[PDB]
Amino acid sequence: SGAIYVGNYRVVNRHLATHNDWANLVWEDSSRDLLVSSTTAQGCDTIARCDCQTGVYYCSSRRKHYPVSFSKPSLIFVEASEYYPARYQSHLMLAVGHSEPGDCGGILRCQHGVVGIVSTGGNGLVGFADVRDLLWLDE
Numbered sequence: 452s453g454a455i456y457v458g459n460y461r462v463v464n465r466h467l468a469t470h471n472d473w474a475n476l477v478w479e480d481s482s483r484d485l486l487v488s489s490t491t492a493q494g495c496d497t498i499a500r501c502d503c504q505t506g507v508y509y510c511s512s513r514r515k516h517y518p519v520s521f522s523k524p525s526l527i528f529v530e531a532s533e534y535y536p537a538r539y540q541s542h543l544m545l546a547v548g549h550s551e552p553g554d555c556g557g558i559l560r561c562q563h564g565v566v567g568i569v570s571t572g573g574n575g576l577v578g579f580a581d582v583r584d585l586l587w588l589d590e
């Protein structure tokens with residue numbers, strides 16, 4: 452679990468979005484595993500606007516942060532799960548690092564701010580949904 456809070460927006464994994472997120476829907480994209488909902492309170496986070504390929508992510512299954520080198524956002528095949536059929540997920544970045552299903556939502560950050568959230572993984576890999584291209588999150 453986990454979310455990004457920026458301005459009057461909450462960014463979460465689309466497969467973990469609550470009834471309240473869908474009732475306050477701003478934008479969602481199944482191909483990216485993202486959903487953005489509106490909030491009443493002002494958010495705590497800054498979004499990075501950069502081309503970094505190194506950063507640090509939070510791994511809830513270890514209660515720890517780990518440094519990572521990650522690929523540029525791209526279209527990557529993701530196996531069928533209980534939430535989606537087998538498909539190409541877009542704007543996805545992979546890295547070597549530990550992850551388990553419940554780690555989705557953990558934030559990846561570089562020196563400029565929030566880069567994205569954990570969305571996929573397996574066998575010593577961790578995949579992050581990029582948010583740096585969503586310029587409208589800051590107005």
Ligand SMILES: COc1ccccc1CC(=O)N1CC[C@@H](CC(N)=O)C1
Pocket residue numbers: 466484529532534535540550551552553554555569570571572573574
């Ligand atoms: C962090 O996820 C891990 C890690 C290790 C093993 C398995 C998983 C779980 C995983 O890959 N998914 C469950 C939801 C589905 C969402 C999506 N982006 O398509 C993908």
Ligand SMILES: [Zn+2]
Pocket residue numbers: 499500501502503561562563564
């Ligand atoms: Zn950066």
